[PDB]
Structures are given as structure tokens and as C-alpha cells.
């Protein structure tokens, strides 16, 4: 786990053989991570939309461990001010908002 | 409630005598709402930081009801692509991430 929101909900992830940190972001539809080298197929994707668009590489069905939970989901790889775990992967780990 | 994340976590809020909808956004530090007229004191605040800054009006200790929970917190008022309930108010309502 139960994570309070007094601080930014940053968690440890394992992806592409690397240990990283990312923000659990219920405001984000998608997961965007930088500085990861993933194997296998990708396609370009345009995201954002303010000031222009940002182009990222979309990798589908990527194995990823998030705070100890091994799941699978789409990971967008590209420049991001902060590594973000979006709703697409929070559903996979069974993460809910509770109050 | 327990809110799953398959869809955007949009909830009903009551603010400044108006009914509105806003996104529960654990990636946002602050709450930003547009098209609300709040009474009482404010000061300008610069937020964002990509491409420049956005100036908003900061109102402190604003009464707000979020999905039935009457709380108090800072509300930033200015044009925003989507109304956002940030961590500052999610803490007030006792909202946690759980998995």
C-alpha cells in the first residue's frame, strides 16, 4: 504494497536486464522509459501532442518486473523527463486507487 | 471506492459551487483545474517547465469535495488540457495505490 501519496510513488523496476526506477503515474495511459535497450521488434509511435509530438519506439509484450511483480506489457522507449509506469502496466500488476 | 485503472480514473468533484470532473493523477504533484471562480486570496505560480512555464493562480486551503470526500487543499487555477487532482489532494482523501 500500500503506497501513500505524500511523496512521489517511485518504484524499482527490472527491464531489459537493467535495474531502473520509475513513477507510478495514473495520469499516464502509457509506460515510457529512457535508456533501455530492448530486444525484438518495435515500431515508431508519436506521443504527447503539446508543442509538437515526441516520437518513441513502441515495443509490444515486453516482460517487466515492477516492484517485484513480473508482468508483460507495451513499453515505449524514448526521451522522457521522468521514467513513467502508465495505466497499461498498473493494470497488469493489479494496482488500484483506494480511498 | 476501489478504482481499477483500465480506464482513466476520472471522478466527480464539487469546487467553488460547481460540479466538475477531474483525473486522479498520481504523477502530478499539484491539483490544476480550469474554469473555476474561487473566492478569497491567490498568488501567481509558475508550473510546468517544458517549452516555458505556465502561470496559474494559487489558492490555498480551498474546500473541495472529491468523489464524496470533503477535504481542503491548494488548488491551482488555470487552463489545463485536463482537470487534474494531484497528490496534494489525494493525500487528503486518504487515497493510496494498492497491489
Amino acid at each position: 504494497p500500500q503506497i501513500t501519496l505524500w511523496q512521489r510513488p517511485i518504484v524499482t523496476i527490472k527491464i531489459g536486464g537493467q535495474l531502473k526506477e520509475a513513477l507510478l503515474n495514473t495520469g499516464a495511459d502509457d509506460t515510457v522509459l529512457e535508456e533501455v535497450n530492448l530486444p525484438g521488434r518495435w515500431k515508431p509511435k508519436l506521443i504527447g501532442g503539446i508543442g509538437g509530438f515526441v516520437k518513441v519506439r513502441q515495443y509490444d509484450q515486453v516482460p517487466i518486473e515492477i516492484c517485484g511483480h513480473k508482468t508483460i506489457g507495451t513499453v515505449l522507449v524514448g526521451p522522457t523527463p521522468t521514467n513513467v509506469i502508465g495505466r497499461n502496466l498498473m493494470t497488469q500488476i493489479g494496482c488500484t486507487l483506494n480511498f | 471506492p476501489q478504482i481499477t485503472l483500465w480506464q482513466r480514473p476520472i471522478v466527480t468533484i464539487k469546487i467553488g459551487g460547481q460540479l466538475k470532473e477531474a483525473l486522479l493523477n498520481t504523477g502530478a504533484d499539484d491539483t490544476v483545474l480550469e474554469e473555476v471562480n474561487l473566492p478569497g486570496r491567490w498568488k501567481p505560480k509558475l508550473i510546468g517547465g517544458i517549452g516555458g512555464f505556465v502561470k496559474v493562480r494559487q489558492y490555498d486551503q480551498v474546500p473541495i469535495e472529491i468523489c464524496g470526500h470533503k477535504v481542503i487543499g491548494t488548488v491551482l487555477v488555470g487552463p489545463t488540457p485536463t482537470n487534474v487532482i494531484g497528490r496534494n489532494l489525494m493525500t487528503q482523501i486518504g487515497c493510496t495505490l494498492n497491489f
Binding site: 513513477l23 499516464a28 508519436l46 513513467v84 | 502530478a28 504533484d29 508550473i47 488540457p81 487534474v84
Partner: peptide
């Protein structure tokens, strides 16, 4: 920061 991300 502050982060509502739409494709």
C-alpha cells in the same frame, strides 16, 4: 512534476 499523458 505533473503528468497527464495521452498518446
Amino acid at each position: 512534476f505533473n503528468f497527464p499523458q495521452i498518446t
